[PDB]
Amino acid sequence: EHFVRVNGGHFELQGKPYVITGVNMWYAAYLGAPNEVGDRDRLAKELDNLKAIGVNNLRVLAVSEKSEINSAVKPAVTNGFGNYDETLLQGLDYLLVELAKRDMTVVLYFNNFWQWSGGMTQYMAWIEGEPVQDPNVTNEWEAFMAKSASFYRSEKAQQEYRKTLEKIITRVNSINGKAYVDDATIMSWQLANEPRPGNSQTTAEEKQIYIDWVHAAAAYIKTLDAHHLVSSGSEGEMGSVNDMQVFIDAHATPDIDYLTYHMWIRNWSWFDKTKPAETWPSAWEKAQNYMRAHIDVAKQLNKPLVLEEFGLDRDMGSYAMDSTTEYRDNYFRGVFELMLASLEQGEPSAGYNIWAWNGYGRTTRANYWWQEGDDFMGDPPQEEQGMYGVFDTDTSTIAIMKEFNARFQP
């Protein structure tokens, strides 16, 4: 029908500006599955609530790789190379039908730097014949990130990645009969969740391999689909081994239509969730700098910029649904205020996706750890259920979302 397009530093839909006022709901396609893995009744109710809060865009995982670790989604879409669960992919079909009824769009990412959907390290585990070592268990994060980036250098891994891209992009929706390439419900194809060049000791050669991978992968998708937007899923500078020139060079290709950045002030040690009053002022100074730096790059490259992930812990780091969210709420207000001013001033700030949406999902696990069969939440299986997710009962947070979702609309 009519697709979301780019014109300079903004998106357009039917010749009018389009601003992303979104959430991350990684599990939305799983929820559409027609078997016991799905919860279609819940999916419709969630999308009805989100639409009522002014949400126009979801960012969703397209594919997962089978993993045996206890920090990963189960079951998976890809049960060994080429062995796709068609019943689960009907969940993506169903999601696309449901979004289209509500004039909502989706950004679909095809891989994962991290472990919670298998992702790049699971590709390498299958190739190498050695199981993934869950970094939640080993705490060997530097080793993990290096293994994950080894994906870019593997010809077999790239062949298999390209096969998966082709499998999904050329899909026909089994429900409505729409080819995916013809479906304007899809806003963008996205290379991966948070692809990084490697660990803190990444070499110049490894930076170039990453740049070349982003270029080649985006160009490959454009051979399949000349018209949908393509984005990388990068965090920005923090996902570029703290080298903004890597970010710039990777995203300078015309086959990348818009820019992404993610902001994780607690993960980056700028904010201490157990010393929030003491650390908030410094964290906010650093967050505003991170936003400004990326807005400047978006001006340089003449592309829209989406804050496609950002979030903050509940008060004192609680996972409980009855805990307060004062710090999170004030953070979201600050980010929204700055971004709205940016947009008013004609800068390439083109919207956002909060990380993440829990909605009607619930856990009764004492340790807040997801187990197979448990409600899917915006917090994926590698984090406590309740870490960053916004519940339907988080009234104060939802009111802020409702307000700004309306204000960001042209």
Ligand SMILES: O=C1NC[C@H](CO)[C@@H](O)[C@@H]1O
């Ligand atoms: O893509 C992501 N970035 C950070 C989130 C919060 O830690 C995490 O859940 C996810 O892997």
